[PDB]
Design a protein around this nucleic acid. Structure first.
Ligand SMILES: C[n+]1cn([C@@H]2O[C@H](COP(=O)(O)OP(=O)(O)OP(=O)(O)O)[C@@H](O)[C@H]2O)c2nc(N)[nH]c(=O)c21
Ligand SMILES: [Zn+2]
Lengths: 727, 748, 482
RNA sequence: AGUAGUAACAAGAGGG
RNA sequence: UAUACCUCUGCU
């Protein structure tokens, strides 16, 4: 009707008290006067509530309550009073009112409320259909990282959501904006369909939608999976010393799967590379590994990702790496690879298209309808295209198709006008094609011309369509089974190298979904901090065993396969010289009796597991590639990596205790320190009587037996002697 | 044997057993009576630190203004306020140099902000000093009063509906020498009874002088800070006025956008992020160093941070940061530093005297501290009077130098940050160098070099370089050691950040919003602490267990099968026996606790939904219930919490009959402000009806410059028409509605 | 400002600035540094709201829940379990008090209990009670004009607190607080059923905690605190003008699981028009005891101690009769004070957090749930005491009770002194820890910190005891190191 | 008295 | 001047 509101409005406007306000205060001011109250924010609500709950009538409720419920309940409890709430036409009420309502008030239909409160009920939904595994106990290193908080966030910006809300809950009173996308429209119609005739305060729907649509992030300490659905349950999933393995209800997300697969495959490859028979070491890990409780094999079988490690794994498991099609033609990549960068770029009419640009040298066999070509592509570059066809037209068509496919600046710069090609609006790659097919007039004027050397069979094409022997369009020329070896090199049938484990990058971010290796080659915990802590733990747990093994038969010790995961953290070329340097430093400790630094042995030992080189280069520290940034373990003394704390009697690796060594080692010292410098013994504090102090780079002009002062590290000047014998 | 819990520290490192040093399970300290003594102590000490500076009388005000900036350099370690404008400008420039196009974007954002900012955005936030009433009031009222007074005098640009048009008026209002305000007072009529005296409130117009209004608009209020942990003696906090708020908002809004893009700025980010920045700086400070270099961290506190932070320096900062931008914007932001540099401080409630022989007590207004015999007071107090009297203006006390806690933020940090950003190898080019993190008085500074003396040099250099901009490191409380262990704002880094759970203990309990909210908060407190502060499973379980016990007792909502005797237990028993599926009843209706580690993130209603009696849930969630009062989206499911100053807390809950509000304070009924309740009661009934014509008003604030009635009518037509035309209404009803719509519009 | 450019100002100004402005690092060494200076004066008195180790219960067997039944009926029921009463006589005087008024109060109360029916018990406003509950002792408020010219009108006494000296008793009280009893004091509400393994683990670990904690004497203080403070807040809010009686009750279970109601004494609440969160309710505490005050008379300054009866007790070999004392006193509290007393159970969290973190800390490195080892595989390995033999290592179960007692005492004796002391001494502890980690600690103004700490040690038994503990710790560290 | 602790409470305001 | 009542208020 809209009747009683104008009756009410008349009945108000009669009263000059308020007819004053309604006339005087504007719509901008009504917001200022709505929040006008005598009441302050309560300073101590916990106290105030404990105070008020002992009173008879502490709750305030709408006066209509006096119509809706009785004054005295069955037991003689007074439910409401006539005393009105300071600053309101509201009544003071007993808690017994709330109970009486809940046991014998009016009933309502609320059965669709879960559609309003979806955001909450999905939490329950994920939990009820979650599954737990076992609890594992270990040093749980957590990265403080910004992460998502709002699983089921249909990702759109605040006002973009606001429009969608306003549409759904406030349809007549909508503002004045366009519904940008099917992103908005589908959500609007679906949520409008879902929330159809639900008896609830619109405000609550607006609130719940506002909470439901927009992304929300937080800085959290996280070990393991960083997906929203895993962030939802950190409190249940991880502790200080424990991991409660858990998979939450419902299905994983392709982006997260594809993202994590790369990191898995990378770590598999980077591990395998170190082991003997890397192919065999890989294959077992690929068979045993499971992502988010799903087989890596059955992922890789039916997952389309193109990455070097993933491709090494696909080649090893014997599944076709990836050919494809575009613009009518079928492309098959023969050589090279490319990394994918999503970007925004401007056409010649300054229109912003959002590409997924490819960077890298690639070679393609392109074929199809009446025309074939070989393509050589660089990052936004057509290096060379050799095109053949049954008609000049069919050539030219493929030429335009490739010239598009290059993603060159030239061709974007070339686009005059806007691109509104379609009711499905095609992606920019196609927009550009279906543009230039309809008009390549400018494209060829701007593409440019080479002079070239005339060859029998080959010919050049000119921007006007002419064929020319010695001139051609930039890069264009007209002319009429995989295997993998022991060490993970990917060869083609001809014997040429496609993919190399030397070319595979480090694992970049942090896993989205959880990775579960069931492989003795890998440690129980994921990541590098794990590797360091476990590698230094195993040593301490089996110290006494390995201490004799150090004395008697070292060359066996150094080949301990438990040291392999540690090697992945060392950079490729350093391992040999590091292990040699280490081994020499140990040998010095054997050759020079008396000196014996169990902690120094424990510290450096894991670097020893590689075939050493004969170089005589000095090292104050060893680098370790952990989570991107290089960490430098100092050879002399404590570090951010390895820190022996005597107060605790504990080795501390990256902030976490790895164990207590034998109390024997606290009371253990000697003035001479072996196992620091190569052919050089340390003999205590630096004495000025051996001249001005030297550096580590200036220790190849000293006599065998000559004492000299050295700035050894961490601002310490030390007395150093060159030893006589050569280890 | 005698037990000594500290002996644990023999075996366990301090940081690992730090909880045992945090006694946060007992009532904190609370000031009783006034904080005039503290305010005067602050005002005194503040001048005492700047005593060497230049004294001058303000022409417009007549306040004894001390200026220390660019004054004589200090020749001892004591707290000094002698900052140097060139030495500031050098750092503030060095910052611009160090962050290419920071200030450009920072300003560019603040411009669009200033352009787009409504007046409404000032009704949000903390309580403000209301120059109209000479008392603190909530922002929404304190503004509304100033707008109403501005409207009653000749000032109505703000009627536009944009913050800068209000912000304008404030500067023009300084011109009007005779400012008209309406004061309220109690009178007493004589009434008959079918004859007794009857109290009643009446109004009285008063006109204030340039002198007065200018003082009142430069007045900041003072209080004692209560519930303050870690400290033996109480401190004086301050509250800003309704004028300066609008400028402070934009200065802080710039300084925020400045801070947000600085690795050394602690503000405005949360602890997890602060810790990430503190990681980043260490990781970087190691990754940049060489294997023959030392690394020393300073655990750092800055003594007398506010007392020695000058507003003229803020004028320099805010100017230099805006340099190159539009001079209107350059001016607008410069207002707050000026207005602060001419700040006067109220001296609070005053004092209370007691006669032992007569057995009587009396109150004294701080305003009376000019004309009062000193025989009543003691030495320390009467001497503080002696000292304050020379600075005392129309009830208030002049405070040109320094600052006071609670008025201004963030920018003060940028001054610190810039002194950190000075310490890059690429700027210093010495044998030593530095970096760190700072927020307000608290700082962590990593100094790197080749040798201990080389570090010492950088310590001295830093320490003096701060003194030159009026920053005073606390030699007492700050300390230094090799990089590895440090303290920062009660975070403890020991080769990595450890746990400090004790800090959060006060958060564990019944927050006292209501049955609905408290249950959602309590669980989330347990949940977030498990994640953030190493609260283990078994203890968390026990926190659930105790929370339930506290919640049940507090709200008198014990389980329906208990024999306890309260005002509810019968009516809860009725419901308990009546109910078929008991597990569905909420704890607040005497149902069982459903929570354990896995459930903590799931709201009680949501968690118990399937198990409820469909009658009972239909009553529980009945949107027609009178216990709830309909909120707005911006304030739906929100509470208030104090960690920092004071912050809002969102929580997850389903709107039930347990989502009520408790009774309001009634003490105002006895006061002369008794009308404000009626004002509120009326004001609400207008918006309540308006919302029927604009349901959209409760989700988004309706932007419009038009009479609130006219908007209601203009719609009331077209709704009444379209309900018929392309709908289901009778033209007799349409004609009746339009006849009403005209009939009321006839009435003025 | 616009046309400013940095030529080289700061360095010039630093050049100009005096060399007295320096941050000179004095390198820190715990072997060098002295003990904290404890204050001297009269010995510190007990200032709790109820008796600790010197409390005495009249108990009855009662199968009721742990907050059920009419508390006065439960009290009456307990009263009857004591046979041999007497005529009351004052044996230790309240030096500043009208010691008759206490003796009249006890009898008034004790008769008023015998002559009541129903739930509510309000005493009648007799002068001797009025005096003890501070009736009328607020001066009458006046306008300043009307009392400008009075001679002795001053501002209220605003001096710092009188210094006091560390008596032994507090360490004793703590030593008892730190012990097990033969009764379950804490009764935890129900939880959601366990599903996740970690929940089962959690409960497994929680059982041990509950075992070590629920019997601990600290927990008996927690329950007394909670009951007293809830009762007092509620009665303060509901009966503002009455003198309500509140019997000091707790409910427990024996080692048999047999349920028992205890009566420690009575509280007579004053008037309670509590407006500000600091406003005071005066009350009278009347509490049973076997302890003779006169053997430690400094401990009981504020109390008037009566002798009220006798009873028999058996030792190991012998068996003898002892007299029963009633410790009577006027005390006070505030909305904020009792609000926090209601919440004392959070101590359990403070205690158990630290332990669970210690268990988990090992569990991580051992790679295994180290709970059942820690509790069951009993090894005394955490230093928690000092005897004439030397440093005394205890077990995790002991550490629980110690930490619990600490956390409880922090709640019972909360004070700005503790607040400051705790905040500042932490820095000195961290300075020690930095040396003991060999991180070369340096300080700028140490004696400033020593004075900042020492400033907060005035008259609080708990803060004095903590200051002492810090010294014992410092010495204990110095010895092992030097 | 007692609470308390750098200043208050030990009811305040009104029917004057 | 005293004694009785009665009203409002318990963060304003
Ligand atoms: C420009 N370019 C396009 N493709 C592939 O060509 C096909 C059609 O290109 P498209 O742009 O229509 O692909 P899609 O809509 O799947 O979005 P995209 O995968 O993000 O591009 C897809 O299979 C692309 O991966 C490409 N493949 C390789 N190897 N190198 C390239 O430079 C390149
Ligand atoms: Zn209960």
């Amino acid at each position: 009707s809209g009747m009683e509101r104008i009756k009410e409005l008349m009945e108000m406007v009669k009263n000059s008290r308020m007819r004053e306000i309604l006339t005087t205060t504007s719509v901008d001011h009504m917001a200022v006067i709505k929040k006008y109250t005598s009441g302050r924010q309560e300073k101590n609500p916990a106290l105030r509530m404990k105070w008020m709950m002992a009173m008879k009538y502490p709750i305030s409720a709408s006066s209509r309550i006096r119509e809706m419920i009785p004054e005295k309940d069955e037991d003689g409890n007074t439910l409401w009073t006539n005393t009105k709430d300071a600053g309101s036409n509201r009544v003071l009420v007993s808690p017994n009112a709330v109970t009486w309502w809940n046991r014998a008030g009016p009933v309502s239909d609320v059965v669709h409320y879960p559609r309003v409160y979806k955001m909450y009920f999905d939490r329950l939904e994920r939990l009820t259909h979650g599954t737990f595994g076992p609890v594992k106990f270990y040093n749980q290193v957590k990265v403080r990282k910004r992460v998502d908080i709002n699983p089921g966030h249909k990702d759109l910006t605040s006002r973009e959501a606001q429009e969608v809300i306003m549409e759904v809950v406030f349809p007549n009173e909508v503002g004045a904006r366009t519904l940008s996308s099917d992103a908005q429209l589908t959500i609007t119609k679906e949520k409008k369909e879902e929330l159809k005739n639900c008896k609830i305060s619109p405000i609550m729907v607006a609130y719940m939608l506002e909470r439901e649509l927009v992304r929300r992030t937080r800085f959290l300490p996280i070990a393991g999976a960083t997906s929203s659905t895993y962030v939802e349950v950190l409190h249940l999933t991880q502790g200080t010393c424990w991991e409660q393995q858990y998979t939450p209800g419902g299905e994983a997300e392709n982006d997260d799967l594809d993202q994590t697969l790369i990191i898995a495959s990378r770590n598999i490859v980077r591990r395998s590379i170190v082991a003997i028979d890397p192919l065999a070491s890989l294959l077992s890990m690929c068979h045993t590994t499971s992502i988010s409780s799903e087989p890596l094999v059955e992922i890789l079988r039916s997952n389309p990702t193109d990455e070097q490690a993933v491709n090494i794994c696909k080649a090893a498991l014997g599944i076709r790496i990836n050919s494809f099609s575009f613009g009518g033609y079928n492309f098959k990549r023969v050589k090279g690879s490319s990394q994918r960068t999503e970007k925004a770029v401007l056409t010649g009419n300054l229109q912003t298209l959002t590409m997924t640009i490819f960077e890298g040298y690639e070679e393609f066999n392109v074929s199809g309808k009446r025309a074939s070509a070989v393509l050589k592509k660089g990052a936004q570059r057509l290096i060379q295209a050799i095109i053949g066809g049954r008609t000049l037209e069919d050539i030219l068509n493929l030429m335009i198709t490739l010239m598009v496919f290059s993603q060159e600046e030239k061709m974007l710069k070339a686009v005059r006008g806007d691109l509104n090609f379609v009711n499905q609006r095609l992606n920019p790659m196609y927009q550009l094609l279906r543009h230039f097919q309809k008009d390549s007039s400018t494209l060829l004027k701007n593409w440019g011309t080479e002079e070239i050397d005339p060859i029998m069979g080959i010919a050049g094409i000119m921007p006007d369509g002419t064929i020319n022997k010695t001139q051609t369009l930039m890069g264009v020329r007209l002319s009429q089974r995989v295997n993998i070896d022991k060490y993970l090199r990917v060869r083609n049938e001809k014997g040429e190298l496609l993919i190399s484990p030397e070319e595979v990058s480090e694992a970049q971010g942090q896993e989205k979904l959880p990775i579960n290796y069931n492989s003795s080659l890998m440690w129980e915990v994921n990541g590098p901090e794990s590797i360091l802590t476990n590698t230094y733990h195993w040593i301490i747990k089996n110290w006494e065993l390995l201490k004799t093994q150090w004395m008697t038969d070292p060359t066996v010790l150094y080949n301990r396969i438990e040291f392999e995961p540690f090697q992945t953290l060392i950079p490729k070329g350093n391992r040999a010289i590091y292990s040699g340097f280490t081994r020499t430093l140990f040998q010095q400790m054997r050759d020079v009796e008396g000196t014996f630094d169990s902690i120094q042995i424990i510290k450096l030992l894991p670097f020893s597991a590689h075939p050493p080189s004969l170089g005589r280069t000095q090292f104050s520290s060893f680098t370790l590639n952990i989570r991107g940034a290089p960490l430098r373990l100092l050879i002399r003394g404590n570090s951010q990596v390895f820190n022996y704390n005597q107060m605790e009697n504990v080795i501390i690796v990256l902030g976490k205790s790895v164990g207590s060594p034998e109390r024997s080692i606290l009371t253990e010292s000697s003035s001479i320190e072996s196992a620091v410098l190569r052919g050089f013994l340390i003999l205590g504090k630096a004495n000025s009587k051996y001249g001005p102090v030297l550096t580590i780079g200036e220790l190849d002009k000293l006599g065998r037996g000559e004492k000299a002062n050295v700035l050894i590290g961490q601002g310490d000047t030390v007395l150093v002697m060159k030893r006589k014998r050569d280890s | 044997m005698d037990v000594n819990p500290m002996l644990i520290f023999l075996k366990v490192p301090v940081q690992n057993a730090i909880s045992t040093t945090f006694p946060y399970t007992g009532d904190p300290p609370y000031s009783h009576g006034t904080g005039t003594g503290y305010t005067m102590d602050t005002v005194i000490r503040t001048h005492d630190y700047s005593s060497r500076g230049i004294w001058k009388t303000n022409s417009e005000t007549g306040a004894q203004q001390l200026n220390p900036i660019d004054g004589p350099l200090p020749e001892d370690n004591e707290p000094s306020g002698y900052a140097q404008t060139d030495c500031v400008l050098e750092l503030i420039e060095g910052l611009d140099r160090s962050h290419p196009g920071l200030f450009e974007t920072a300003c560019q954002e603040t411009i669009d902000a200033i352009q787009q900012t409504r007046v409404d955005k000032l009704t949000q936030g903390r309580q403000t000093y209301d120059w109209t009433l000479n008392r603190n009031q909530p922002a929404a009222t304190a503004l509304a009063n100033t707008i109403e007074v501005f409207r009653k005098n000749g000032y109505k640009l703000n009627e536009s509906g944009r913050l800068i048009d209000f912000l304008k008026d404030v500067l023009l209002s300084f011109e009007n020498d005779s400012m008209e305000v309406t004061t309220h007072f109690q009178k007493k009529k004589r009434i008959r009874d079918n004859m007794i005296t009857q109290r009643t409130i009446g109004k009285k117009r008063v006109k204030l002088t340039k002198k007065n209004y200018l003082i009142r608009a430069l007045t900041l209020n003072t209080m004692t800070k209560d519930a303050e942990r870690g400290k033996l003696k109480r401190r004086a906090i301050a509250t800003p006025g309704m004028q300066i708020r609008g400028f402070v908002y934009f200065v802080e809004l710039l300084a925020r956008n400045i801070c947000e893009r600085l690795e050394q700025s602690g503000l405005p980010v949360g602890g997890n992020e602060k810790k990430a920045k503190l990681a980043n700086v260490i990781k970087k400070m190691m990754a940049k160093s060489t294997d023959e270099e030392l690394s020393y961290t300073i655990t750092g506190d800055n003594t007398k941070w506010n007392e020695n932070q000058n507003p003229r320096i803020f004028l320099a900062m805010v100017l230099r940061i805006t340099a190159g931008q539009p001079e209107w914007f350059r001016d607008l932001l410069a207002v707050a530093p000026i207005m602060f540099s001419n700040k006067v401080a109220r001296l609070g409630r005053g004092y209370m005297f007691e006669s032992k022989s007569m057995h009587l007590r009396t109150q004294i207004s701080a305003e009376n501290l000019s004309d009062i015999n000193l025989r009543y007071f003691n030495e320390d107090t009467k001497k503080k009077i002696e000292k304050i009297r020379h600075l005392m203006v129309e009830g208030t006390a002049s405070l040109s130098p320094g600052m006071m806690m609670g008025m201004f933020n963030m920018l003060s940090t940028v001054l610190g940050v810039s002194v950190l950003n000075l310490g890059q190898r690429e700027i210093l080019k010495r044998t030593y160098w530095w970096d760190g993190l700072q927020s307000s008085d608290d700082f962590a500074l990593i100094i790197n070099g080749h040798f201990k003396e080389d570090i010492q040099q950088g310590v001295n250099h830093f320490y003096r370089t701060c003194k030159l901009v009026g920053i005073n490191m606390s030699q007492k409380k700050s300390y230094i050691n090799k990089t590895g262990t440090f303290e920062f704002t009660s975070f403890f880094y020991r080769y990595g950040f450890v746990a400090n759970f004790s800090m959060e203990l006060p958060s564990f309990g019944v927050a006292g919003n209501n049955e609905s909210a408290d249950m959602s908060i309590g669980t989330t407190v347990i949940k977030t602490n498990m994640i953030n502060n190493d609260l283990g499973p078994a203890t968390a379980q026990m926190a659930i267990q105790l929370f339930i016990k506290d919640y049940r007792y507090t709200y008198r909502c014990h389980r329906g099968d208990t024999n306890l005797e309260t005002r509810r237990t019968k009516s809860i028993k009725r419901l308990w026996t009546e109910t078929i599926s008991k597990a569905g009843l909420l704890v607040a209706d005497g149902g069982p606790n459903p929570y354990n580690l896995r459930n903590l993130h799931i709201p009680e209603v949501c968690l118990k939904w399937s198990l409820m009696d469909p009658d009972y849930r239909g009553r529980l969630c009945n949107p027609n219930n009178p216990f709830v009062h309909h909120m707005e989206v911006e304030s739906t499911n929100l509470a208030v919490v104090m960690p920092g100053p004071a912050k809002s807390l969102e929580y997850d809950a389903v709107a039930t009959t347990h989502s009520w509000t408790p009774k309001r304070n009634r003490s105002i009924l006895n006061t002369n402000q008794r009308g404000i309740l009626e004002d509120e009661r009326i004001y609400q009934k207008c918006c309540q009806v308006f919302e029927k014509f604009f349901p959209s008003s409760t989700y988004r604030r309706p932007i419009g410059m038009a009479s609130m009635l006219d908007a209601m009518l203009s719609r009331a037509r077209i709704d009444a028409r379209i309900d018929l035309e392309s709908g289901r209404i009778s033209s007799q009803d349409f004609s009746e509605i339009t006849n009403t719509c005209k009939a009321i519009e006839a009435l003025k | 400002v616009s046309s400013f450019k940095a030529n080289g100002n700061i360095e010039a100004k630093l050049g100009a600035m005096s060399e007295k402005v320096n941050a000179q690092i004095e390198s820190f060494d715990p072997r060098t540094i002295r003990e904290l200076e404890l204050p001297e004066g009269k010995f510190c008195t007990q200032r709790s709201k109820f008796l600790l180790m010197d409390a005495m219960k009249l108990s009855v067997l009662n199968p009721a829940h742990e907050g059920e039944g009419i508390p006065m009926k439960d009290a009456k029921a307990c009263l009857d379990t004591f046979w041999g009463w007497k005529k009351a006589t004052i044996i230790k005087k309240h030096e500043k008090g009208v010691n008759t008024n206490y003796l009249m109060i006890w009898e008034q109360l004790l008769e008023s209990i015998k002559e009541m029916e129903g739930k509510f018990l309000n005493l009648k406003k007799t002068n001797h009670l009025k005096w003890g509950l501070g009736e009328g002792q607020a001066p009458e408020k006046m306008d300043f004009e009307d009392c400008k010219e009075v001679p002795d009108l001053f501002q209220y006494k605003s001096e710092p607190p009188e210094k006091r000296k560390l008596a032994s008793w507090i360490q004793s009280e703590f030593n008892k607080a730190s012990e097990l009893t033969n009764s379950n004091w804490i009764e935890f509400d129900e939880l959601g059923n366990d599903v996740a393994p970690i929940e089962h683990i959690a409960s497994r670990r929680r059982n041990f905690f509950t075992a070590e904690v629920s019997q601990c004497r600290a927990s008996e203080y927690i329950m007394k605190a909670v009951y007293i403070n809830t009762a007092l807040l509620n009665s303060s809010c509901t009966a503002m003008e009455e003198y309500q009686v509140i019997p000091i009750i707790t409910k427990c279970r024996d080692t048999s699981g047999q349920r028992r109601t205890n009566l420690y004494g009575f509280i007579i609440k004053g008037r309670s028009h509590l407006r500000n969160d600091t406003d005071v309710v005066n009350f009278i505490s009347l509490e049973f005891s076997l302890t003779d005050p006169r053997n430690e008379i400094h401990k009981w300054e504020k109390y008037c101690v009566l002798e009220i009866g006798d009873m028999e007790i058996r030792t190991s070999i012998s068996t003898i009769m002892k007299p029963v004392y009633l410790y009577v006193r006027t005390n006070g509290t505030s909305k904020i004070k009792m609000k926090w007393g209601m919440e004392m159970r959070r101590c359990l969290l403070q205690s158990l957090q630290q332990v669970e973190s210690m268990i988990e800390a090992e569990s991580a490195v051992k790679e295994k749930d180290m709970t059942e080892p820690f509790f069951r595989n009993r090894e005394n390995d955490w230093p928690i005491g000092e005897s004439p033999q030397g440093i005394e290592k205890g077990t995790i179960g002991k550490v629980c009770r110690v930490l619990l007692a600490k956390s409880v005492f922090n709640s019972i004796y909360a004070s700005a002194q503790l607040e400051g002391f705790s905040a500042e001494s932490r820095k000195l502890l961290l300075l020690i820890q930095a040396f003991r980690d060999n991180l070369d600690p340096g300080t700028f103004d140490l004696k400033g910190l020593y004075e900042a700490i020492e400033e907060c040690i005035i008259n609080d038994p708990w803060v004095l005891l903590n200051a002492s503990w810090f010294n014992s710790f410092l010495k204990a560290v110095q010895l092992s190191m030097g």
